């Protein structure tokens, strides 16, 4: 449950993070940069968990409809098929979550990340970037608090919908433990932004929480947040 050892994992990757754990809503922070997690960071990809909610709930779409590939260069040939939400999910296909978010629309969008009080809860006037380049920002803390809302089924959304987007987020799945999470990096902005946000279910159905939030290098190879995350949660003995 230290704190010192898990301070040098971060030290060891050359990275600045933190590692925000919550446990029946007691937090605790880890890593070499502990003041990022009151730190306001642009969500990245994480905001896909709201984005699905949103879009669900106001049935802009479900997690049967196929999403189009029109042909269009992605950022990833992995990307570049027609998929369902949950597919895009687990890819972080961002083209399929833009559409997503036209749906929407500016203020359908706009209203939802206010009364669900996200972040500074402003996403500007494009509907389809506010999470990878701002407005919209979070902080770590933030991030598990919402996270961990979502695994108690405590937002403010029907359960079935919690229960659709928390099926798209399982990770691994062994020893009777299960870890659910979204993965984050912001790219396009400097400093660049990781983040690996979910949690545990533990074989009693015991749920811990966790955001980690890391600057990042366009060296790095992404699975150092899975890395950094594992190690840390094995050491707290989480996992
Ligand atoms: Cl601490
Ligand atoms: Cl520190
Ligand atoms: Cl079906
Ligand atoms: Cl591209
Ligand atoms: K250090």
């Known amino acids: 449950g230290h704190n010192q050892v898990i301070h ?9 993070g933190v590692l925000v754990i919550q446990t029946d809503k007691k937090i605790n922070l880890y890593g070499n940069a502990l003041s990022r997690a009151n730190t306001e960071y642009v969500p990245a990809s994480t905001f896909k968990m709201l984005n699905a909610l949103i879009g669900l709930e106001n049935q802009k779409t479900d997690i049967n409809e196929i999403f189009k590939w029109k042909g269009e260069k992605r950022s ?14 687990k890819l972080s296909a961002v083209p399929v979550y833009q559409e997503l978010a036209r749906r929407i629309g500016l203020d ?5 990340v206010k009364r669900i009080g996200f972040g500074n809860a402003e996403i500007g006037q494009q509907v ?6 701002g407005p919209l920002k979070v902080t770590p803390i933030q ?11 405590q937002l403010p959304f029907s359960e079935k919908v919690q229960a659709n987007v928390k099926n798209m987020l399982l990770l691994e799945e062994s020893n009777g433990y299960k870890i659910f999470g979204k993965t984050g990096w912001a790219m ?3 400093p660049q932004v990781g983040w690996l946000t979910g949690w545990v279910e533990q074989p009693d159905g015991k749920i811990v929480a966790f955001a980690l ?4 290098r366009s060296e790095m190879p992404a699975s150092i947040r899975n ?9 707290l003995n989480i996992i």
Do not use: C, P, R
């Not at 389809?128 to 380049?133: A, E, G, I, M, Y």
């Not at 890395?227 to 050491?235: A, F, N, T």
């Open 213 to 216: 939030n890391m600057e990042m």
């Open 128 to 133: 389809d970037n506010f999470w990878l380049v």
């Open 76 to 89: 990833f040939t992995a990307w570049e098929k027609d998929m369902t939400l949950g597919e895009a999910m």
């Open 108 to 112: 359908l969008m706009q209203k939802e």
């Open 8 to 16: 040098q994992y971060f030290d060891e990757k050359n990275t600045s």
């Open 227 to 235: 890395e950094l995350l594992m190690k840390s949660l094995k050491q």
């Open 143 to 153: 991030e598990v608090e919402f996270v961990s809302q979502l695994a108690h089924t």
């Open 188 to 190: 396009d902005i400097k």
